[PDB]
Amino acid sequence: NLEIGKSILAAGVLTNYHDVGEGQPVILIHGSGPGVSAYANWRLTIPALSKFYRVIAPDMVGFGFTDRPENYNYSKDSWVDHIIGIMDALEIEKAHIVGNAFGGGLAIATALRYSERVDRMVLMGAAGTRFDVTEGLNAVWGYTPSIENMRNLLDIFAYDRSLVTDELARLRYEASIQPGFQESFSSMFPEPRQRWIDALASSDEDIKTLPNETLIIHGREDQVVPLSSSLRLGELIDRAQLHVFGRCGHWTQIEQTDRFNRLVVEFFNEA
Amino acid sequence: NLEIGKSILAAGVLTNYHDVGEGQPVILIHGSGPGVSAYANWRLTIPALSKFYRVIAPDMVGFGFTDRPENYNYSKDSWVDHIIGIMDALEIEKAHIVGNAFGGGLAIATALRYSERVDRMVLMGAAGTRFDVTEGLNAVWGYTPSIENMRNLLDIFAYDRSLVTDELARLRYEASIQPGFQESFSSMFPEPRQRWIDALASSDEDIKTLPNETLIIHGREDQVVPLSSSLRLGELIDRAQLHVFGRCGHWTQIEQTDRFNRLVVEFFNEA
Structure with a gap:
């Protein structure tokens, strides 16, 4: 299983992560969704970026193959603690961070609490602002296992539905039912879900204090996080x-892969 | 005078233009303003692009050193005719077009009337949609010569006012008072100026029919053409x-030169 990488204790949690490349460190933080993991999110990104940077992509606590602590309290602050713990464990004193959606919200929160630990940021279809819950987001966070439910989520994420094959839906469905996966995921964002969008967000006042060079990326047709959020x-x-990106949904790193990779590498190259 | 380049008859008008590089043709169309010319607008762009493309930058009729025909009727359609005439004169059957503001409006209009002659488009702080007249735009089109009036226009264009030096204001003022320059310019967009923004614009219906891969660029702080226009x-x-581009005004090719050049070259490289 390529989703399984290396293991390290971070913030007291046994963490599954990928570490490829050498040089300036870049932390990739995946989005949220059933069966999501660092590999599933960044498989097409790591290869390109690792040619010029040291790329670290961990499975956030509660997702992927990282340990799921009993009675663990999933929260923005605890996830930020995990990110910092991972950086500490790897002696990463300062790094660029790429956050996808849920991960974008965490990136902003990390840059606010640990400003000196974060250099440049790339925020993709990022959480971080208070936007009204969308049906797309409620469908993702309210997912229950089935190939049809997964097919719908993939449709929600994609601009080009022809990319949503029976095979992909089947594979993602299987990932979503791995031991403990649905259990932890479903416990994360229970109804009403607006509470969690708001909890993951940072205040306008705080966001305005961010000194970091930042690149905000969004797919015009994103059905999960509205374009208006990134405009904000x-x-x-x-x-x-x-x-x-026009003609692009919620996962820009997949539907606009080459353009995305080029933009990110050049953005970090400026530093 | 480096603003003086080569001369060619295009659409019956003796035209001043620059032609540098080899390969795929790219037409650069300057913006509008007192003393504006292709060189003044693209001096920092041509060098970068000409390394990979054949760059053609003409002075649109009524601007720069191109002939100013007696009783000439300055209009969107006549300017489009000039662009096509320039391409015809140079045997340029199809080309990418980069249009700055006023020039962006012309690029859209050219792509609509001569779709087969236009490949990819880059629209910067582009005219092309009907936006409410701004004080910045009225100040530019309503300019009368003086170093102080030019200093104000430069301030209006720039995000970083420290770039507006006495020397630059002096040089641009001198360019604005060359024989016939202010005369033709002031005759172009007389009050009420909303009429001309609307005349340069293309309808939503027509714009939606554009099949071209397009890159829309805008400076967040643009005081002349509102960001809302490019969002539209x-x-x-x-x-x-x-x-x-955050921390960027109306002339992105000057204040975000390297980023702009990189984005444009890579965008055309995809073709």
């Missing part, structure tokens, strides 16, 4: 650039 | 990407 981030963060 | 273009054009 683009107005709040001072040293920000906004790049919107 | 980003929703209307199907194969579009929107890139907004």
